[PDB]
Each structure stands twice: as C-alpha cells, then as structure tokens.
Design a protein around this ligand. Structure first.
Ligand SMILES: [Cu+]
Length: 59
C-alpha cells in the first residue's frame, strides 16, 4: 500500500480549519489509514474554508 491523496469540498457551507481537519481524519480512519498531512482549500469569509486536500497513509 502507498498513501492515497484525497480532495473534499462543499459548495453549501464555509467551515473552520477544525471542521476540515476532523473530516480528513475521519475519512482516513474509515479507510483503515492514518491522516499524515492536509491543506485547506478555497478560503472563505475571514477564517473559514470550503474544502480540504489530504493524504492518508497505511497504519
Ligand atoms: Cu488541524
């Protein structure tokens, strides 16, 4: 297994870093992997974002 790069965004809500980190973490965990890195996408408002791109790696 290698690590997998994944991209998620929403067109209906802007959310904080914490929400997107949570989404990335839980996505990797559902795939039996661990989140290694991530970066926010599509900054919104003064402190929010509309997506995240992240890398899930083998346990
Ligand atoms: Cu974070």
């Amino acid at each position: 297994e290698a690590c997998k790069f994944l991209h998620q965004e929403r067109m209906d809500v802007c959310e904080t870093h914490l929400h997107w980190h949570t989404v990335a973490k839980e996505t990797c965990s559902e795939k039996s992997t661990n989140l290694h890195d991530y970066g926010m996408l599509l900054p919104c408002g003064i402190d929010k974002f509309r997506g995240v791109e992240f890398v899930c790696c083998p346990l």
